[PDB]
Design a protein around this ligand. Structure first.
Ligand SMILES: Brc1cc2[nH]nnc2nc1Br
Ligand SMILES: [Cl-]
Ligand SMILES: [Cl-]
Ligand code: NA
Length: 327
């Protein structure tokens, strides 16, 4: 079967307690120290608030969890505690419970983010390189810690464009990578799902996040957000195949012995692989360079095992201007 080219055995080389999140026993502090100020968002299993820690007057974010999902709560807590101190990973400050109802909540550092729909319209060439480099640091870190994020998308990459701070958030879908483990493919936002998920290939790895990152890079340099805009999960693969080509898709499926849902027969059609230069026009030409296209071409590949790792991406010439400035 398939396995990760990097970090494959990292969890098996650690203590079982590192990855055995079902056995994790969080230390639950008291939510009464936090005053909710404003609702920021809501999801299937959580609600998120700006809040003040009344004991030190610090602004924080509080994510209240539906208490029923106990295994999933332990998973997210253990992952966040394993990632503590990681570069550009949102900092978990506290794990707390309502002292009466025992409903759990996660307390995070606050970040004053610029909404990505507004931000992505004004980014410069250097800004894209800079923020992509910072996001890659977060993914290289979590991958090196044996963790797949599985929900990389603009909404989960919080950017304070005034202070130049980036944090990868929402670790509620993240999982530990173990070689040969078969994972649930119902992860990531539709537009950021790797082809492996869309063809029901369960033996995926950290390289899933690299597809999602490539999708973000393409949306930022080309100013088409989201870049692959499917109407459902079937159409999502069609949108990908329109660009990467159908014959290349079939070679991928053959290599991994992947059976294709026969509903694809009536919708995939026949598509050449397109040159990435086809996406350039006057509105995006200043964000596109040969080095951007070379990097993107090495991320948005069907074959998950041939996509760049986060580290290989960081090492690409596209980021040399950022590395030099950070000197
Ligand atoms: Br900070 C922060 C952390 C999160 N984790 N999951 N959702 C989140 N939202 C915000 Br805002
Ligand atoms: Cl899973
Ligand atoms: Cl297209
Ligand atoms: Na409280």
């Amino acid at each position: 079967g398939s396995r990760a080219r990097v970090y494959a055995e990292v969890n098996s080389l650690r203590s079982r307690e590192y990855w055995d999140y079902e056995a994790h026993v969080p230390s639950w502090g008291n939510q009464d120290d936090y005053q909710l100020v404003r609702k920021l968002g809501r999801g299937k299993y959580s609600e998120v608030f700006e809040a003040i820690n009344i004991t030190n007057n610090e602004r924080v974010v509080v994510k209240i969890l539906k208490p029923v999902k106990k295994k999933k709560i332990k998973r997210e807590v253990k992952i966040l505690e394993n990632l503590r101190g990681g570069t550009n990973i949102i900092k978990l400050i506290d794990t707390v419970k309502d002292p009466v109802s025992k409903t759990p909540a996660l307390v995070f550092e606050y970040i004053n983010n610029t909404d990505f729909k507004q931000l992505y319209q004004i980014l410069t060439d250097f800004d894209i390189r800079f923020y992509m480099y910072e996001l890659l640091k977060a993914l290289d870190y979590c991958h090196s810690k044996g963790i797949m994020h599985r929900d990389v998308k603009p909404h989960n990459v919080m950017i304070d464009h005034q202070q130049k701070k980036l944090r990868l958030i929402d670790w509620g879908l993240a999982e530990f990578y173990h070689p040969a483990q078969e994972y649930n493919v119902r992860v990531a936002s539709r537009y950021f799902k790797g082809p492996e998920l869309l063809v029901d290939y369960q033996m995926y790895d950290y390289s899933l996040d690299m597809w999602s990152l490539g999708c973000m890079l393409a949306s930022m340099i080309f100013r088409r957000e989201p870049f692959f805009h499917g109407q459902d999960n079937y159409d999502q693969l069609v949108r990908i195949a329109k660009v990467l080509g159908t014959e290349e898709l079939y070679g991928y499926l053959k290599k991994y012995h992947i059976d294709l849902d026969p509903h694809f027969n009536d919708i995939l059609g026949q598509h050449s692989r397109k040159r990435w230069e086809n996406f350039i026009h006057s509105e995006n030409r200043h964000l596109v360079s040969p080095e951007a296209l070379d990097l993107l071409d090495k991320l948005l590949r069907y074959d998950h095992q041939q996509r760049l790792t986060a580290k290989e991406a960081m090492e690409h010439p596209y980021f040399y201007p950022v590395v030099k400035e950070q000197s």
